[PDB]
Design a protein around this ligand. Structure first.
Ligand SMILES: NC(=[NH2+])c1cc2nc(-c3cccc(-c4ccccc4)c3[O-])[nH]c2cc1Cl
Ligand SMILES: [Ca+2]
Length: 223
């Protein structure tokens, strides 16, 4: 997260860290046995780390569970990153409490101007790598479809939305991919892609979760 602030240990109880010996992506806990992340964060050998704050020190509240299966959306296109969503079932259910809790899925999509909370352990520099140990937060608005399309012409599908600051300086970045974009208490986006980080006129692009709600529910139901 570039230009964000420290969230405070456990103030974002649905945030998860995807680990394969190091932190590589974020995710969102939607129920005690399922997490939603981005399809491009897929890989085998994933350990989900819940109740985390400082990813390099065990401090208490952490729960490490291995993933049972990972279900990448069947129409995921790695070239366009359209349908960039993936579900991970956990080997055992997590114990939910105030420090580890799920986030709700939306009932409607959000509109431009809605303010959302984006968090993660991603890079905090737009030029060079500087990953933090603790969870960072950024409040950002959903932009209008026209501003999104003017910024990424020919690259935005109806399953994506832009959120951020066209002036640059504040944005999500590498390490943040797969994590949550929560607006009014509902999971509306998944950190997907962007051109660099916190660059002027190049906002973050997120998977539009409201278009996958029926799929998430059907898929969890049949697995
Ligand atoms: N808001 C942005 N401008 C942005 C920048 C990103 N940069 C990345 C990114 C860059 C290199 C590698 C990965 C990556 C993905 C999966 C596993 C490991 C690295 C990234 O997510 N994701 C990004 C996601 C966003 Cl939304
Ligand atoms: Ca820790």
């Amino acid at each position: 997260i570039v230009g964000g602030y420290t969230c405070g240990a456990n103030t974002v109880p649905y945030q998860v860290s995807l680990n394969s010996g190091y932190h590589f992506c974020g995710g969102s806990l939607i129920n005690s046995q399922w997490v939603v992340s981005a399809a491009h964060c897929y890989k085998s050998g994933i350990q989900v780390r819940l109740g985390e704050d400082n990813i390099n020190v065990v401090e208490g509240n952490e729960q490490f569970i291995s993933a049972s299966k990972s279900i990448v959306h069947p129409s995921y296109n790695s070239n366009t990153l359209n349908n960039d969503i993936m579900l991970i079932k956990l080997k055992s259910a997590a114990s939910l409490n105030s420090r580890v809790a799920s986030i709700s899925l939306p009932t409607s999509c959000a509109s431009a101007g809605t303010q959302c909370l984006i968090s993660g352990w991603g890079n905090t520099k737009s030029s060079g790598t500087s990953y933090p140990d603790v969870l960072k937060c950024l409040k950002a608005p959903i932009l209008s479809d026209s501003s999104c399309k003017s910024a990424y012409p020919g690259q935005i599908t109806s399953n994506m939305f832009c959120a951020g600051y066209l002036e640059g300086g504040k944005d999500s970045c590498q390490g943040d991919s797969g994590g949550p974009v929560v607006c009014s208490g509902k999971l509306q986006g998944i950190v997907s892609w962007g051109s660099g980080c916190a660059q002027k006129n190049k906002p973050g692009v997120y998977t539009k979760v409201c278009n996958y709600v029926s799929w998430i529910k059907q898929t969890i139901a049949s697995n």
